[PDB]
Design an enzyme around this catalytic site. Structure first.
Site: not given
Ligand SMILES: NC(=O)C1=CN([C@@H]2O[C@H](COP(=O)(O)OP(=O)(O)OC[C@H]3O[C@@H](n4cnc5c(N)ncnc54)[C@H](O)[C@@H]3O)[C@@H](O)[C@H]2O)C=CC1
Ligand SMILES: O=C(O)[C@H]1OC(=O)[C@H](O)[C@@H](O)[C@H]1O
Ligand SMILES: NC(=O)C1=CN([C@@H]2O[C@H](COP(=O)(O)OP(=O)(O)OC[C@H]3O[C@@H](n4cnc5c(N)ncnc54)[C@H](O)[C@@H]3O)[C@@H](O)[C@H]2O)C=CC1
Ligand SMILES: NC(=O)C1=CN([C@@H]2O[C@H](COP(=O)(O)OP(=O)(O)OC[C@H]3O[C@@H](n4cnc5c(N)ncnc54)[C@H](O)[C@@H]3O)[C@@H](O)[C@H]2O)C=CC1
Ligand SMILES: NC(=O)C1=CN([C@@H]2O[C@H](COP(=O)(O)OP(=O)(O)OC[C@H]3O[C@@H](n4cnc5c(N)ncnc54)[C@H](O)[C@@H]3O)[C@@H](O)[C@H]2O)C=CC1
Ligand SMILES: NC(=O)C1=CN([C@@H]2O[C@H](COP(=O)(O)OP(=O)(O)OC[C@H]3O[C@@H](n4cnc5c(N)ncnc54)[C@H](O)[C@@H]3O)[C@@H](O)[C@H]2O)C=CC1
Ligand SMILES: NC(=O)C1=CN([C@@H]2O[C@H](COP(=O)(O)OP(=O)(O)OC[C@H]3O[C@@H](n4cnc5c(N)ncnc54)[C@H](O)[C@@H]3O)[C@@H](O)[C@H]2O)C=CC1
Ligand SMILES: O=C(O)[C@H]1OC(=O)[C@H](O)[C@@H](O)[C@H]1O
Ligand SMILES: O=C(O)[C@H]1OC(=O)[C@H](O)[C@@H](O)[C@H]1O
Ligand SMILES: O=C(O)[C@H]1OC(=O)[C@H](O)[C@@H](O)[C@H]1O
Ligand SMILES: O=C(O)[C@H]1OC(=O)[C@H](O)[C@@H](O)[C@H]1O
Ligand SMILES: O=C(O)[C@H]1OC(=O)[C@H](O)[C@@H](O)[C@H]1O
Lengths: 265, 265, 265, 265, 265, 265
Positions: C34, C50, C70-73, C112, C135, C164
């Site tokens: 996005l 989006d 990986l994209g999303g909230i 989660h 979420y 994590s």
């Molecule tokens: N970082 C972690 O340890 C964990 C991550 N996850 C997940 O794996 C993925 C990546 O996580 P992160 O990199 O930490 O999050 P982030 O919040 O750093 O990456 C998410 C990306 O998706 C984009 N996005 C949000 N809404 C969008 C839309 N409507 N259309 C297109 N793009 C959109 C954002 O702009 C963003 O850059 C997510 O789906 C997240 O829920 C799940 C558990 C743990």
């Molecule tokens: O459980 C976590 O450490 C994580 O899990 C989630 O799904 C998130 O994307 C993240 O940023 C964290 O809070």
């Protein structure tokens, strides 16, 4: 209903019962056995053939829309006889069905496939086999063979592990193992009426209070037995000696079969 | 007993039944639907509103002591309709309940949450979801959301996976899935009377011999359905063509829903 | 391994890592988000859009041989935002995949989805969901939807419930939830090399002594994480305040997410 | 059935019932209690003694063919009293039985062995104990001791975890825990008639719609309770105050025992 | 770290080991036993007292931040000795802990709680107790009591079912049961460091190839034993006579304890 | 170690390997096969006999302290040949052992007993058989027969369901099924060294990352395989075409055996 139902082992105990009881299920009842049969009445065909004879078995099955397979060795016996009737004979039956439209099969399996389990243990359909002799082992063979045919060719079979199919319970074990004529007949009707059967293990017992076996996973079939061996508990106490707690009769699900040695010819 | 019971989807098939059957349960029955509702009689209030409209749902729920949530898209439809009625709608319902004393909820989930299981497989309440379409997925969403509100806020919900809640079983599948009006009514009564409910999965079926689902873990509720689809087997055999063994109708628990494509507007 | 690999959420925390680490897996890496992306280098394509917009998602997916989604909230947020990225976005992604050769998907689900379980309980892949917020509920939606597309159309997806995924563990909970960059990269490699994948739930954690989750049923994939958070325990003990035993951080698998309220726009 | 049946705790609530109801089971009923017994009638023997005194317990047991062991501390009390009747007393009873032909024992265990489980959880016989006080812990001791004597010496015991054995259910919890006099008497009959018993855990409840416990694995005994507390629901609803959802009475299987403190002498 | 750690049974085999190994865990080590203790060194306090003496146990526990409870009868003995040390003693210990801030407890339970299981059966933590003597039964009592204090008051205990905690494996059984000093020490460290413990059953064995017990559900603790009895198979084969296949030593998990009679004073 | 070890099928693939590898296990190695054997060297005896010949089998076994039974039909073949080598032949082997001291048996069973399971499913030793042809069925027969002999006579047998015992993995399936020579040799040594064996199902595979089978319940044996097919993954990609996802090779545990028809003579 169906045009032609085959009943094998039709000269034996259960066979003679089914010759009468299953008549209404088909336009033609074909009875078969290695032994002589009472002559065919109207709406009957009678066949004499050894299950061990592949060609005879093929002809026995050809033209039948269903099979109730009761034929074979029914008690512990020397290997040679069991091999013929229950092993070679099973292969011939399944080949014959495969060549003639795969008519649905009710296989008379046996409690003796699990005869070494203690009577205190409640068994589901997936428990590991614990056959109590060569006979039990051969019934396991029929089950494994039927399963392979189902997975490989779609041949459907009810693997009916019969308890004790008698006019009435007549000893303590049968308070658990009794399978009434009515309930076996209704099971057979439920098996043939099902659009989809698969190759399920079915515990062949009536609805006995003292039952050891769990048919709940067969619920999709819609078969609930109606008779209850428990009604006969007093009858049993008044017509037999009380069991000795050390008797296989009350210790093992296969009863005294566990006490059988390997019989020789 | 309770002051006011909300019934959503009150204009639909089930809603119309419950508008009548649940009256004795509350001083006032508040009926709601997006579609026109027959005018309110004595001890009735009628509200026509869209579940997707958050403010409307808030007012719909305010002052209610319980909710039977039948409202929403009830078959496979394009994503947007289901999103509004069953996803946004559920969020709105739960937020509304949260703002107004967390009235206990009977949620009409569906067998279609698990529609892809074979009919030969008996299911307990903890089995992994296998939704058979967007409708099924949306009912899963409802179950997941309700669980979260339970764990987070203590909101209690009965997640009723309805089979086929109709006047009578109409086909072979309904021999397993039928959920009589009487049994659904007694379930709802059992749900609301319970001092403690939690957020249980409930299989919505009568006491059918051919039932596929195991409600034993719900025993604490003291609800035992009394009707039995088996009584209709003969009748169904007599008045409908025998199913083809290859039809989803007798192969999958979700019946023909598995054959649904993804519908577009 | 493949011609073009799509990485969505490529501007985010994990996205930036995978943009570098997954380059060797395909001739062309297509990055999407996005938000603004650093300019495409050699062997890269970048698209800003989006997930809620079907036409854009269709273009994003077209020509791709695999997707790491990986994209999303990524945290608890108001329903409106989650609806767009995680619910509507998921539907759009699956429809686009279905229209373009069903490229295999690695879905970033989340711990989660089961955040309300106590940390003392070991979980296999089939446990009922206990999402700790909107979420978590939205990641469950993703899993349920993916499973439906697998059963209906054969679309294959790895549902990776990430713990994590950080450079290193930095609190007590992470001694259990840590999922190293290396181990996530190797999982992705094992997911794409598999001739057959299905739609498995995968627990996204390294080989941590204090891990809560059981991947044993995923053995057929041949993936064995090699990192171990336990090596960081001393560091964490010295670098951070001991957790209060009443802190969600040490009581629920979702940690502090259970303490999140419902956020409003 | 037998020559002499010992009933301990014969002066207590259940003791007085069994003194009358079990008379037909043996030629001679021997009644024992710490407290005074109504004088022995024809076919009765009465002995007043403390289970803590080995010589007295030896005399109590000698010549008996079966034991219904109801004697002991029946509610939460200081440890000192429980130690005497339920711990020392149990050791003494088992040693006396071992010295006198190992007469089969019906042990009055208690639901309080598992009192800390929530009412929403259905329990099979193998669940880990969660005793709700010293009393519950002492009944666990009885079970553990009996099991040891079974494994070591073959002493057979039915470990009956009694719910609420009363003339009728008189509160909400009893809709689940009620164990009618008739159904306890029939269980005792089924326990003593069995050729083989072993050392089974038995849930002591009638066939209540709202029952929490699963006796299915006890099927081999052929005992089916026939009474149903559900018939008393209306009566209870009208005769008693609705339970507060936060009351132990509707939250834990042990009801208000969980609220008991440790009582001191 | 912690101000004061109590070690009971400090004069025994294990106690002597822990008096040395656990010193680094607390500013002060309070050692206790009924038998004479080597005099207190710096950072030590020694108390000689009987666990059956309630007042003494109170003073023994007062001011302690943790307890490693090794004290008590450690083999099969007559009932009175075990009653005092292991039953009355446990009640006294738990009451003392309850009056003094509920210091966390490492309880030395025993494999003899399950001694009658065959060695061929792999055991998880929830298996039903099968104690092999009065000693085993008394360790069950400890586990049951501790669980009750956990559920009722929040007292936390690790119920460590110790196998054979010796310098080296000495016989065939110890190839399965061996629990190295190092691994017991690391377990204790893991127990005390845990923010949340609960009241878990822990199998007290090293990482032996021939281990019989499954500690996987304890994963949250982050304790992985490092020693392995298998390294000693050769050595044991070389220095001990091969076991007779009929010896309890290689037939029952409790080894020769199953052969113990009931000992009398 | 033992005086005389019999190796049947000693002229076949695995036989020639074991003739060399198992030499150190016994003072005398007796090799047998229906086919000619390389002449006996020192410390060898060589026997030519048909497993179908009862008397020859008796003489083959007489004087042996152990049996590694590799002889028989090893691939799908017409029924007549399988009957001879694997059914009749198994009966003769077990009778022969029973007549000559019941030497412990390592039975070469097969993965093909469960060949119809999907490769995605992890299997424990108790799963129901799903044989993928006549060959698999005959291996099931050997298993059921061995089990009966164990329950009836105490004959001990390791039922080793061999995966792919080759010098190295050489296709994708073998990344899961590979059983190295070393690991099979070590298993055989572990089986003979055990004081107590019973009649366990053993999954014959090395410690492969991609393994499908769970041997954890066999822990008592102390056998941990050391080789890992995963080391060969690159070798496989560089020496074979990538599998088609629709190939039985990657869909069924029995691989292409599922594709075998019923072969005829
Ligand atoms: N970082 C972690 O340890 C964990 C991550 N996850 C997940 O794996 C993925 C990546 O996580 P992160 O990199 O930490 O999050 P982030 O919040 O750093 O990456 C998410 C990306 O998706 C984009 N996005 C949000 N809404 C969008 C839309 N409507 N259309 C297109 N793009 C959109 C954002 O702009 C963003 O850059 C997510 O789906 C997240 O829920 C799940 C558990 C743990
Ligand atoms: O459980 C976590 O450490 C994580 O899990 C989630 O799904 C998130 O994307 C993240 O940023 C964290 O809070
Ligand atoms: N009677 C019972 O309660 C139970 C019966 N069963 C079984 O169900 C079936 C019927 O049992 P019963 O009627 O009591 O036995 P039976 O011994 O009274 O019936 C068996 C029949 O098969 C025939 N048969 C034997 N070898 C044959 C061969 N080589 N070729 C052709 N026919 C052959 C016999 O001549 C005979 O009439 C059997 O397969 C049996 O094993 C299993 C469990 C319990
Ligand atoms: N009848 C059965 O056998 C089964 C019923 N169910 C379900 O239980 C409920 C009742 O089922 P039926 O009466 O058969 O369906 P229906 O389609 O006859 O009843 C549903 C009602 O909800 C209303 N509705 C739809 N979208 C709405 C929105 N956005 N806002 C407010 N109202 C809306 C409709 O107008 C309608 O009257 C449904 O939620 C349904 O999914 C689930 C499985 C089986
Ligand atoms: N009534 C119920 O619904 C339930 C009863 N139980 C139990 O079944 C049994 C009978 O229960 P109730 O009749 O209600 O209790 P009770 O308190 O009315 O009967 C117990 C009797 O044992 C005697 N006793 C106490 N200590 C003794 C000792 N040291 N030596 C010899 N006798 C001693 C008492 O004097 C008394 O009459 C008990 O063991 C009890 O724990 C367990 C669950 C429910
Ligand atoms: N060493 C092993 O392999 C296993 C040990 N355990 C156990 O863990 C603990 C330590 O075992 P060991 O050192 O081998 O036994 P030990 O017999 O060498 O240690 C036990 C100590 O407790 C003391 N004690 C006995 N009765 C007492 C009382 N009434 N009041 C105060 N102290 C009393 C003894 O004097 C003694 O020094 C015990 O509780 C025992 O049952 C359980 C299974 C295996
Ligand atoms: N090679 C593998 O990875 C696997 C092997 N197995 C099995 O383990 C064993 C050895 O397999 P292979 O060495 O590869 O097979 P093979 O076909 O190379 O060895 C079999 C031997 O048994 C003999 N034999 C056949 N019928 C006989 C009879 N009626 N009387 C006496 N001897 C007879 C043959 O002449 C032959 O040398 C077999 O029982 C087989 O089914 C099971 C799974 C996998
Ligand atoms: O267990 C039984 O009652 C029977 O089972 C068997 O399988 C027999 O065919 C039969 O005659 C009986 O002995
Ligand atoms: O399975 C059913 O009968 C039904 O499933 C559904 O959940 C519907 O609401 C309905 O109309 C049916 O088709
Ligand atoms: O749970 C109950 O109703 C009872 O259980 C108990 O074990 C008692 O003996 C009794 O009097 C009750 O409180
Ligand atoms: O199983 C063991 O090695 C031990 O069991 C026990 O719990 C003892 O304390 C001990 O001395 C041993 O005999
Ligand atoms: O699955 C395999 O690799 C093998 O299994 C079998 O049982 C065979 O004997 C063999 O040659 C193979 O085809």
């Amino acid at each position: 209903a169906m045009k032609r139902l085959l009943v094998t082992g039709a000269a034996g105990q259960l066979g003679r019962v089914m010759r009468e009881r299953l008549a209404p299920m088909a336009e033609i009842l074909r009875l078969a056995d290695l032994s002589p049969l009472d002559p065919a009445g109207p709406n009957e065909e009678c066949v004499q053939c050894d299950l061990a004879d592949a060609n005879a078995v093929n002809a026995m099955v050809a033209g039948c829309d269903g099979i109730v397979h009761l034929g074979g060795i029914s008690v512990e016996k020397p290997f040679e006889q069991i091999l013929q009737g229950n092993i070679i004979g099973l292969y011939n039956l399944y080949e014959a069905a495969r060549a003639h439209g795969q008519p649905r099969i009710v296989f008379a399996s046996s409690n003796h496939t699990i005869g070494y389990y203690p009577q205190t243990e409640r068994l589901g359909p997936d428990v590991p086999a614990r056959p109590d002799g060569l006979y039990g082992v051969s019934k396991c063979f029929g089950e494994n063979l039927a399963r392979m045919y189902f997975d490989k060719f779609g041949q459907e079979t009810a693997l009916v592990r019969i308890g004790s199919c008698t006019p009435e319970p007549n000893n303590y074990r049968m308070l658990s193992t009794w399978f009434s004529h009515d309930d076996f007949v209704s099971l057979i009707e439920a098996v043939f009426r099902a659009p989809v059967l698969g190759c399920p293990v079915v515990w062949g017992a009536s609805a006995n209070d003292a039952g050891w076996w769990d048919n709940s996973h067969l619920g999709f079939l819609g078969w609930k037995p109606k008779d209850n061996a428990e009604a006969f508990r007093r009858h049993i106490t008044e017509t037999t000696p009380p069991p000795d707690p050390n008797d296989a009769l009350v210790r093992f699900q296969g009863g005294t079969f566990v006490d059988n040695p390997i019989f020789k010819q």
